[PDB]
Each structure stands twice: as structure tokens, then as C-alpha cells.
């Protein structure tokens, strides 16, 4: 796992490449019911979160992918007041949907509580969010969790661990339609995607899948240094057919970027977010 | 190389590192200048390396060598006479001269060694020696900058502060240049400290980048500047149509994705701009 000061992230999901991180201190390494769970004090990154091997988050870069999956469905969204995370252990999703007064409430739904735990001892910058009196915390598989709720949410986002280990039920295709099911009538979720630099096959099927789903769909990006290949993807999907996920529904001031301590998004970078390289614009449209 | 697999380990990207796994490897010379490298990775095709550090891969190279070809050419309203400093793949030669404005590629390289291997090891970005457009000169691209003065419509800069007054000197009245940039994730400092730099010699300085997974952090930047005080960098004076994309078999490049390399992420936003 560290060999000779480094942690080096090998997976068959994106075969003959890796990313090492150099390791300064080794913080936590313990099995919970659901998963392995590594954090470690990097030279260079501060602390990382690995789960069954797979690098969660790193502390420098966390900001991107946290900003980036919270605010490009509220931001689409012209009244999102309550709010459904799906995964988001670390509390870093929690944190940045939290931010916008229109959110009264967040229902955050985890599988694995020894996640929160560590998270709240390792990545205090990220699970600051559990200190919001917006949150209602729930523990269990998502994908029953949301079998629960019908017409609830106006926003959903899912903040997923790895295909393997427990975020495979969320990764089953009746998910979406779940997902449908529990928004209200204009509701918008979010997931984590694919990264279009590998694999962007299951991109296009996922997209054809919600477009049979839902009046407007969307796939957009951001970069981020330490997931494979060094950025990953959102489906963004509305129940509202007027909904236009590239042109934020509410932009926001530069005021509101600097109160919210933004350090990635703002409305341009919204916006850019669905720009893609032609390969991959050709391939989805 | 390394139980198979190529770790790519840079002081100037501390405690991070990409590996690329090894199918074979096929070359390992030093030249009159640097240590050479290439092999067959496993899947990410042949990969090229300078002194340890990558310089390309066939799967992904297309990113960088579109993206360093087309921000400069297509903000100029008839680029015909290029210079391309470095470029010893070939790769970024083989996007230029696509472009029927052109008429002349000036290359300057420093080490022949690099485009022999490349030639044999990577032919899909050497395929570029073979345009008729080609004046191949040899050297350091430094001292060669100093022999021109008024010669050039665009100068690209593929590379491995005096350099950029020497390449406005070089320039037309109403030229253009690219220059590999910094990675914004890595050294967004530099970023800055060039920008001020080139704002003080040209009237319009723009910063770009693009992703590119086997870049260190995943993606790269470009320096543009211009000695028209009238360019837009951002929007492209030369939109290319759906047509022309497809015509120019491009995988990354569009006039979309030209304006959005310019929209960076809020805390270099921030850096570049208050
Ligand atoms: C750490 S967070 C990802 C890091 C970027 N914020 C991913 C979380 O998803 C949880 N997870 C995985 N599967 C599920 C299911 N099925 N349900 C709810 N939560 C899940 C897992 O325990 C992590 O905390
Ligand atoms: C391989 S290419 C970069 C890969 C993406 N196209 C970098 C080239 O720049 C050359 N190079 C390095 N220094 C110089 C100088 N000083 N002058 C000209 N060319 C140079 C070096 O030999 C490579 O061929």
C-alpha cells in the first residue's frame, strides 16, 4: 500500500497508469464494516482519504470537485430549498451546498459512520459541514435510502465512493429513476460521472439512459489533480425541460463567490464546465 | 524503469508522481544534450522522455499539439509565416500546416537525435517532416531568435524572461506567439510573475491551458501575446466551422473550447486578474 514513502493508486477501472502521492506520515489504516479506510499526511497534498485503495480526497485540491458538484445543480435550480446528498462522508459536499440561503435543509444519507468518524478527526476543513443545523444525517445504503422518498428534493446530489465496495448499488441503472421518483416536479440531481479521458463509452450509454429519463440532460467537468487522469465528470439531469444546465439559472455576483469563499467555481467557470474537447462533444452529441 | 512500470518523479512537482505501465522498451540513448527514452507503454501507446521527464504520448499528445498550434493561428486574421521553437516530435509541425494561410514553417531544433526517434517511434506526430511548408533549421532556439527581426506572422515555442523580447523582435508588426505556459495547479506564482513580464513588452497577454492526462496535474498552459493591440485571444479571429474541424481531423480543438481555455478556475481568476 505505502511502499518506500509513497502510495502509488493502481485500479483496473484505469488500467496501466497511476498517480503516487509521496507519504509523510501514515495517520489511520482500519477496516470498517463496509471498506478499507487509509488517511495519510502527504508532503505535498496535506491529508488524503483512501478508500479501498482509491484516493478520495486530498485536502489541497478537495475545493474543485466539492464546488464543483454542489454548485452547478443549485446554481441550476431557480429555488433549491431542500437538499439530498447521497454519500459525502468527509462533509465536504455538506459544507458547500450549506452556503446558499436558500437551503433550509440537507438530508445527507452515508453507509459507513467509521468514515464520518475519521473524516472529522483528518479532514477538518472538509467536515466543518456537520456543523451546520441544516443537516439531517442518515445512515444506510442510498439506493434503499431513496426507494423512501417521493416528490422530497429539489436538488440531489451523489457524492459516490468507488464501483466496487458499497457505491455499486448506487451505480445500478434503476438508481436514476429512483432519483426521478424522489425529486419533486422541477427537481435537478447531480452524480459523480465518468472522466472523459477514460471512459467515455459509459458516458454516452449513461446519457442515453437519462435522456430516455428525463426532458434535460447534461454532462459537464472540472479539473482536479488527484482523481485518475486529473479530472472527472457530472451528470446533471432536470425533471424541468426548461432547465438549461450550461447558462447558470442563478449566476452568481463576484460579492456572492467571495462571501462564499469559492476557490474554483463561479458563473464562467459554470459555464465552461460543459465545454468539451471535441472528441468527447462528438462522442455525446 | 522500475517493476515494470515508469515513474516520472520532477522537483518541480514534489511529492506527486505519474507511473506508466511498461510493454516494452524500445530506446535508451543520450544525445549531445539529454537523455532520451521511449518506450511502448501498455496503454497510453509509445511514450517519449526527455532527461525523466515526458514529453508525450500517442494517445493523448493531440490535446497539447492542437491546443499550442490553433490558440495562436486562430486568433490571427492570416498567419503565413510561422516559427516553431523545439517540436522535435514532429506533432505540433503536423497541426500548423493544416491551415492553408501558411505557406511557410520555419522549426528550429536543437538535438536531431529527437526527431530521429520520433520518426521511428512515433509516426503519427513525425508525419509533419513530410509537408512541403517545412524549413528545418538546427539549433539553440535562443541564439537563433537573435537572426530574425520583422520575419514572423505566429511563433510557437514547443519546448523541453530575454526570450520574449527576442521573439517580439522576430515578430511582425501585428504578430502573435504561444509559449508552453505553467501548470496553474503547480505554479501559478510563475504564471503571474510571466504575465506581468509579457504585459510589460506587448499590449495584449492572455494565459490558456488545456487537460492532458500524462502532463504533471493533468493539464498544461500557454502564454499568448500579441503586438496587436487590437487581438482578442479569447475569441477566436479565425472561428473554424463543424466542417473545417472534421476537415482538420481534430480530437480536441473546436472554436468553443478555444473560449473556454481562457475561463480558469476561480483562485487563478483571482491571481491572474486582482
Ligand atoms: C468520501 S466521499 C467521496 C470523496 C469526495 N467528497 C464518498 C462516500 O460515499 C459513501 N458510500 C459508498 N457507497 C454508498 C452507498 N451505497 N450509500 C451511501 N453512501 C455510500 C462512502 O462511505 C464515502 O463516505
Ligand atoms: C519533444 S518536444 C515537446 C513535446 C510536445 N511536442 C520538445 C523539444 O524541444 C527541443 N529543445 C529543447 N531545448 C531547445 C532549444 N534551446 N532550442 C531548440 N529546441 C530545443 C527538445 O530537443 C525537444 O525536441
Not at 148 to 165: L, R
Amino acid at each position: 500500500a505505502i511502499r518506500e514513502g509513497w502510495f502509488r493508486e493502481t485500479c483496473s477501472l484505469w488500467p496501466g497508469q497511476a498517480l503516487s502521492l509521496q507519504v509523510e506520515q501514515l495517520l489511520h489504516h482500519r477496516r470498517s464494516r463496509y471498506q478499507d479506510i487509509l488517511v495519510f499526511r502527504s508532503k505535498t497534498y496535506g491529508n488524503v482519504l483512501v478508500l479501498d485503495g482509491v484516493i478520495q480526497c486530498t485536502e489541497r485540491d478537495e475545493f474543485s470537485y466539492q464546488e464543483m458538484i454542489a454548485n452547478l445543480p443549485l446554481c441550476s435550480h431557480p429555488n433549491p430549498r431542500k437538499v439530498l446528498i447521497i454519500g459525502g462522508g468527509d462533509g465536504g459536499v455538506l459544507r458547500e451546498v450549506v452556503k446558499h440561503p436558500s437551503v433550509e435543509s440537507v438530508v445527507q444519507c452515508e453507509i459507513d459512520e467509521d468514515v464520518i468518524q475519521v473524516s472529522k478527526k483528518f479532514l477538518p476543513g472538509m467536515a466543518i459541514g456537520y456543523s451546520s443545523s441544516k443537516l439531517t444525517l442518515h445512515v444506510g445504503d442510498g439506493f434503499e435510502f431513496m426507494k423512501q422518498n417521493q416528490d422530497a428534493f429539489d436538488v440531489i446530489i451523489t457524492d459516490s465512493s468507488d464501483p466496487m465496495g458499497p457505491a455499486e448499488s448506487l451505480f445500478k441503472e434503476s438508481y436514476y429513476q429512483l432519483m426521478k421518483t424522489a425529486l419533486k416536479e422541477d427537481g435537478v440531481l447531480c452524480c459523480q460521472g465518468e472522466c472523459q479521458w477514460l471512459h467515455l463509452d459509459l458516458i454516452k450509454e449513461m446519457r442515453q439512459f437519462c435522456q430516455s429519463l428525463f426532458p434535460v440532460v447534461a454532462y459537464a467537468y472540472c479539473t482536479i489533480p488527484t482523481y485518475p487522469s486529473g479530472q472527472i465528470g457530472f451528470m446533471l439531469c432536470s425533471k424541468n425541460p426548461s432547465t438549461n444546465f450550461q447558462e447558470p439559472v442563478q449566476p452568481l455576483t463576484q460579492q456572492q463567490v467571495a462571501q462564499m469563499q469559492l476557490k474554483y467555481y463561479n458563473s464562467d467557470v459554470h459555464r465552461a464546465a460543459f465545454v468539451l474537447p471535441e472528441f468527447a462533444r462528438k462522442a455525446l452529441n
